[PDB]
Amino acid sequence: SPAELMMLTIGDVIKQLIEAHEQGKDIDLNKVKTKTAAKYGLSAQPRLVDIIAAVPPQYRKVLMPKLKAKPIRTASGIAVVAVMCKPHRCPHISFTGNICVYCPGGPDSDFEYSTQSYTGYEPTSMRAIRARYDPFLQTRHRIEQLKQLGHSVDKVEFIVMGGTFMALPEEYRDYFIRNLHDALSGHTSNNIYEAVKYSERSLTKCIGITIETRPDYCMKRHLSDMLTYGCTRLEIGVQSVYEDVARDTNRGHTVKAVCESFHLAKDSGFKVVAHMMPDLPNVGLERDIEQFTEFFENPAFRPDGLKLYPTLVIRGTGLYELWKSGRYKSYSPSDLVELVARILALVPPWTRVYRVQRDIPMPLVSSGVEHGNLRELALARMKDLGIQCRDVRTREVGIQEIHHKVRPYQVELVRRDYVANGGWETFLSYEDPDQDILIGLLRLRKCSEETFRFELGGGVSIVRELHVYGSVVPVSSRDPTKFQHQGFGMLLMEEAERIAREEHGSGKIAVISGVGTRNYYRKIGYRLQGPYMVKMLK
Amino acid sequence: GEEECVLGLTDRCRFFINDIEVASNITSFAVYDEFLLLTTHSHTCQCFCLRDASFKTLQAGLSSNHVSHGEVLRKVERGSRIVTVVPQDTKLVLQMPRGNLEV
Amino acid sequence: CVGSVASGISVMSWSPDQELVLLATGQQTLIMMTKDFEPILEQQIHQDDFGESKFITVGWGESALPWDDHRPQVTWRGDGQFFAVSVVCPETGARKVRVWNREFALQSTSEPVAGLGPALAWKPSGSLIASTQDKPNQQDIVFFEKNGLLHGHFTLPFLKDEVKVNDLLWNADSSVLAVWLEDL
Ligand SMILES: CC(=O)SCCNC(=O)CCNC(=O)[C@H](O)C(C)(C)COP(=O)(O)OP(=O)(O)OC[C@H]1O[C@@H](n2cnc3c(N)ncnc32)[C@H](O)[C@@H]1OP(=O)(O)O
Ligand SMILES: C[C@H]1O[C@@H](n2cnc3c(N)ncnc32)[C@H](O)[C@@H]1O
Ligand code: MET
Ligand code: SF4
C-alpha cells in the first residue's frame, strides 16, 4: 500500500538529514526527496508539512531553520491572528431604514450564517463557523496551525473583524476580550482587569489589538473603553473625500465627522488606517486622481495606513439592481491597472499599504475585478512607465529580501516632519539610502490643545509606534543573521526623548503599549500610569 | 581657494562659476561654512569642500564623466529643494513638492 | 470683413490653440465657428436641462448683486477639451454657470449659490474653476468643480461692503492667482 511506502520514505529523509547534521555537511533537500522517492516506487513527492510533523524533539528544535514553509508569515517581525465576532446588524439600520448600497452578506441575506460584509466562503470565515464563533477555540486553532508550519509564535497581534464591534452590548465585549487574553496567557479570569494583569505577567506577549469602527462610534467614551481593552490600532472606512458620494450611497455620516474622529483618535494616541474604494458610482476616471492627490496633500486627511478596495458588484444588493438596469458600468481592466499604478505612485514614504484588493471568490462576482494578483501587475506596469513605489511595506528588509536579493550595507538615520490633523508629526527611521531599504521606525506627536485624557494634559508628548522589521527573534535570544535584537530600539527612544524636551518643550513623555512592551519600557526606565507608560523629562 | 568668485544659477538649470559653465542640470545650491551644496535633476545631492579646491578640481567633479564614490554623492527623492544648512550639527534641510520636510 | 451678426457681439473667445472661435450675440445665443470662419453650430444659452452627466441614485437614502453689469463670461480649459459660460439667468434672477465639451454638447449646470459674483477663471492645469461670493459678514473666493459643485474657499481680508472684485486670472503654470479689487 502507498501509505507505508510514504512513511518509510519520510523516515529515510529525516534519517539522511539528521546524519548530515551530525557529521556537519550541507544537503540539498529536493534531490534527496526525489532520489528517496525513486527507491520505494512512488508516483508522488513528499510534502514539507509531513516532513516537519515527524522529527524527533531535539532534532525538531535544531533543524527547523531548514524545513520552514511560507517564510512570509513571519517576515515582518510579528505573528498575526485574525478572529471574528458574532453576527449582528449594523447600527444605522434603524434611523435610515437600510444599510450601505454595496455591502454583501449579513444577518438578513442569502449567505447563511455569515457576518456582515463577508460571504462565509473566506478562509477566516470558515474557521470561525466550525468553531461556532468562540474566541478561545479560534485563537488556539490558529496558533496550532502557525506552529505546525514551523514558525515562532513568541510575539502575537490580534485582528478583530466582523461588523461594528463597538455597537454590541458591554457584556459580550467583556467576554470576548477577556477570553482572548486568557487564551494567550492561560489564566481563567472574571473581568477585563484581572485578565490584563495576568497577561502583563505572561510569557506569550500580546503586542496589540486592532478594531474596525465607524466614525460615529469613535468618541471620548468609546476611545476610553478601547484604551482599557489594550487596543492600539483603528480601522475606519472613509471610501471617498466627496460629500455627495457619502450621502448617495446611504453611508449614514459625513466627511467632517471623519476628520473630527481622526483628530480625536490621533490626539488620544492611536494609529489610523483608512479604507478607500475606487470606481464608486458618479465618480469618473478623472475624479479618482484628484481624490487621492487631495487625500495625500491636504493636512486634514493624511492617514498612517491605506487599504485599496476596488468596487465589486455582488448579488442581493442595491448596486446589483443598478447594474442590471444598465446604469452602472465598471472600468476596463487596462484602465484599472493604469489607475492603480498611478495611485500607488503617489503614496508618501511614511504610509504603509496593507492590502490592495478584496478576497471574494471569483464565481460570486458579477462584474469588476476578475484576476487575483492586481498588486504585482500594477508593479510591473509601474516599472514599464518609469515610476517607483516608495511605501513602507515594499521597502522593509524582509520584503526586499524575499522579492529581491539585497541586504543593507550603509545604514543611516532619517527624520521627516509634517503637519496632520492639527498636530505636529515627526517620523524617525533607520534606513539604507542607496538601495532604499527600511529597518526600523518610530512615530512621535506633540499633543494639541484639545486633548481630553487626564494623563496627557499639561505638556505631554506621546509616542505612537515603535517597530523594527526582519524575521522574528524570540525574547531573550539573539541571532546575528537577523535584525531585531541589535540595539535599534534604544537608539530610537533616546532620540525621541531629546526632541520632546529640547524642541517640543514638554515635561513628560508617554507611550501607548501592549503588555510585553510594558515590561520592555519598564526595563528602559518608564513607570505605569493609567493605561500609559510615562516618564518625567525635567 | 584663495580668490573670490561669482556663482550664478539660471531658471533653465545652468550653473556658472565666473564666466565658465560647469554644470547643466542643477536645481538648487547653497554655500555654508566653506562648503558648497548642490541638487541635480538626476535626484542627487552633492557636497564639496572649498578650503582646498580649484576651478579645475570642481569642473572635474562636475564633469558628467566621473564614477561616483560614496562620500560626495547621495541619493534623494524627486523634486527636492535645499531650504537651509545647519553646519554646527552637520544637517541639511530639504523640502518636497507635497509640502513636508526632511533632514 | 469676414463675418456679420444682425445683433451685437458681447464677447469673443479663442481656444488656447487657435482652431475654434466662440461668439456671443445680443439675442442670448452662442455661435461656435472654425478657424476659417465657417460656422459650425449655434445654440441658445438659456437651456432647461442638466445635460448627460446626471447623478444616479438607488433611492435607499437670492438676487444678483447691485453692481453686476450682466455680461456673459466664457472660459476655456488649458488643453481645450471643455469650456464654461457664466450668465445671469432671468428665471432665478441670479448667476448661473454651465459647462460644455469641445463638440459643443451640454455637460453640467452649477448648483444654486446665494451671492455669486460675475467673475470666472478656469485653472490652466484643469482642476478648479474660480469665482467669488459675498456672504453675511465676509467675502470669499470659492472654487467650483467640473461636476458643478463647490469644493473649497478662502477669505479676503476686508470688511463687508468695502470692495468689489472686478476680475480673476490665473498664471501660465498655475501657481499664482491675481485678484483685482476696487473700492466702493
Ligand atoms: C510598544 C509597541 O507599540 S510595540 C513594539 C513593537 N512590537 C514588536 O514586538 C514587533 C517587533 N518589535 C521589536 O523589534 C522589539 O520588540 C522592540 C521594538 C520592542 C525593541 O526592538 P529591538 O531593537 O529588538 O530592542 P533592543 O535590541 O534595543 O532590546 C533588546 C532587549 O529587549 C528585550 N525585549 C524585546 N522585546 C521584548 C518584549 N516584548 N518584552 C520584554 N523584553 C523584550 C530582549 O529580550 C532584549 O533584552 P536582553 O537582550 O537584554 O535580554
Ligand atoms: C470591509 C470593507 O470592505 C469594503 N467593501 C464593502 N463592500 C464592498 C464591495 N461591494 N466591493 C468592494 N469593497 C467593498 C468596504 O471598504 C468595507 O469597509
Ligand atoms: C467591516 S466594514 C468596515 C468597518 C465599519 N463597518 C465601517 O464601515 O467603517
Ligand atoms: S457600515 Fe460597513 S459593514 Fe456595515 S453595511 Fe456599511 S460597509 Fe457594510
Curated annotation (Swiss-Prot), chain A:
Acetyl-CoA binds at residues 155, 465-468, 488-490, 521. GO terms for cellular component: cytoplasm; cytosol; elongator holoenzyme complex; nucleolus; nucleus. Its EC number is 2.3.1.311. One of its GO terms (biological process) is regulation of translation. The modification N6-methyllysine is found at residue 220. Tyrosine-phosphorylated; phosphorylation on Tyr-193 does not affect elongator complex integrity or ELP3 protein stability. Also serine/threonine-phosphorylated. Pfam families: ELP3_N (PF23613), Radical_SAM (PF04055), Radical_SAM_C (PF16199). Residues 387-538 form the N-acetyltransferase domain. It is an enzyme of class 2 (transferase). Changing residue 320 to F: No effect on tyrosine phosphorylation. This is Elongator complex protein 3.
Curated annotation (Swiss-Prot), chain B:
This is Elongator complex protein 1. Belongs to the ELP1/IKA1 family. Homodimer; dimerization promotes ELP1 stability and elongator complex formation. Component of the elongator complex which consists of ELP1, ELP2, ELP3, ELP4, ELP5 and ELP6. Interacts preferentially with MAP3K14/NIK followed by IKK-alpha and IKK-beta. It is linked to Neuropathy, hereditary sensory and autonomic, 3: A form of hereditary sensory and autonomic neuropathy, a genetically and clinically heterogeneous group of disorders characterized by degeneration of dorsal root and autonomic ganglion cells, and by sensory and/or autonomic abnormalities. HSAN3 patients manifest a variety of symptoms such as alacrima, decreased taste, decreased sensitivity to pain and temperature, vasomotor instability, hypoactive or absent deep tendon reflexes, vomiting crises, and gastrointestinal dysfunction. Component of the elongator complex which is required for multiple tRNA modifications, including mcm5U (5-methoxycarbonylmethyl uridine), mcm5s2U (5-methoxycarbonylmethyl-2-thiouridine), and ncm5U (5-carbamoylmethyl uridine). The elongator complex catalyzes the formation of carboxymethyluridine in the wobble base at position 34 in tRNAs. Regulates the migration and branching of projection neurons in the developing cerebral cortex, through a process depending on alpha-tubulin acetylation. ELP1 binds to tRNA, mediating interaction of the elongator complex with tRNA. It is found in: Cytoplasm; Nucleus.
Curated annotation (Swiss-Prot), chain C:
It is found in: Cytoplasm; Nucleus. It comes from the Eukaryota. Belongs to the ELP1/IKA1 family. It is linked to Neuropathy, hereditary sensory and autonomic, 3: A form of hereditary sensory and autonomic neuropathy, a genetically and clinically heterogeneous group of disorders characterized by degeneration of dorsal root and autonomic ganglion cells, and by sensory and/or autonomic abnormalities. HSAN3 patients manifest a variety of symptoms such as alacrima, decreased taste, decreased sensitivity to pain and temperature, vasomotor instability, hypoactive or absent deep tendon reflexes, vomiting crises, and gastrointestinal dysfunction. Medulloblastoma: Malignant, invasive embryonal tumor of the cerebellum with a preferential manifestation in children. Component of the elongator complex which is required for multiple tRNA modifications, including mcm5U (5-methoxycarbonylmethyl uridine), mcm5s2U (5-methoxycarbonylmethyl-2-thiouridine), and ncm5U (5-carbamoylmethyl uridine). The elongator complex catalyzes the formation of carboxymethyluridine in the wobble base at position 34 in tRNAs. Regulates the migration and branching of projection neurons in the developing cerebral cortex, through a process depending on alpha-tubulin acetylation. ELP1 binds to tRNA, mediating interaction of the elongator complex with tRNA. Homodimer; dimerization promotes ELP1 stability and elongator complex formation. Component of the elongator complex which consists of ELP1, ELP2, ELP3, ELP4, ELP5 and ELP6. Interacts preferentially with MAP3K14/NIK followed by IKK-alpha and IKK-beta. This is Elongator complex protein 1. The chain holds residues 104 to 308 of 1332 of the full protein.
